Amino acid sequence: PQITLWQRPLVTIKIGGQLKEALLDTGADDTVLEEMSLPGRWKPKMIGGIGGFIKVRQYDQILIEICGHKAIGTVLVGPTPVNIIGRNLLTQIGCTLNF
């Protein structure tokens, strides 16, 4: 599809068998998810921006379905108010910027 920027580019995603809202974010290197449980081990990480840094847990090889497209890769889980789909998964689903 083609997603407008008049509003935040929020789309529905599915992870596990859970459906959520997430932001398609070209400014984010990584995908950041709101606090949730995932199985397996993780690595500690710190990620920052305007304002500073939050502590997150890095899981690898996580499936996120985005508008029917299955992306598999690293996700960072922590105290974000919004699920953020970053370039590591946007590339997989063939997402481009166009103007």
Next chain:
Amino acid sequence: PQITLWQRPLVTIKIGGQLKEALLDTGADDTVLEEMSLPGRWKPKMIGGIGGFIKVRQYDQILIEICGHKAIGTVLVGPTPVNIIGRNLLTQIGCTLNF
């Protein structure tokens, strides 16, 4: 143009007679640039960031040329990890996400 996301979508911008590199950030509501002087009136503004709000300077109706596309709008100047072009100006140059 069409911009893929395997790398950061950093582009050259011309603002206030100066050439800069900035990140095209669909996740950003607003455009935020590193410390620089710009002509005209500005007001202090607080913006929501990681773990809290940050003080920026707000300059309205500023011309900026992105990839050869002209935008005229609000630019915030303050402590950002990188120059980011947010939806306020991305909408003006016709930017959408596609997959």
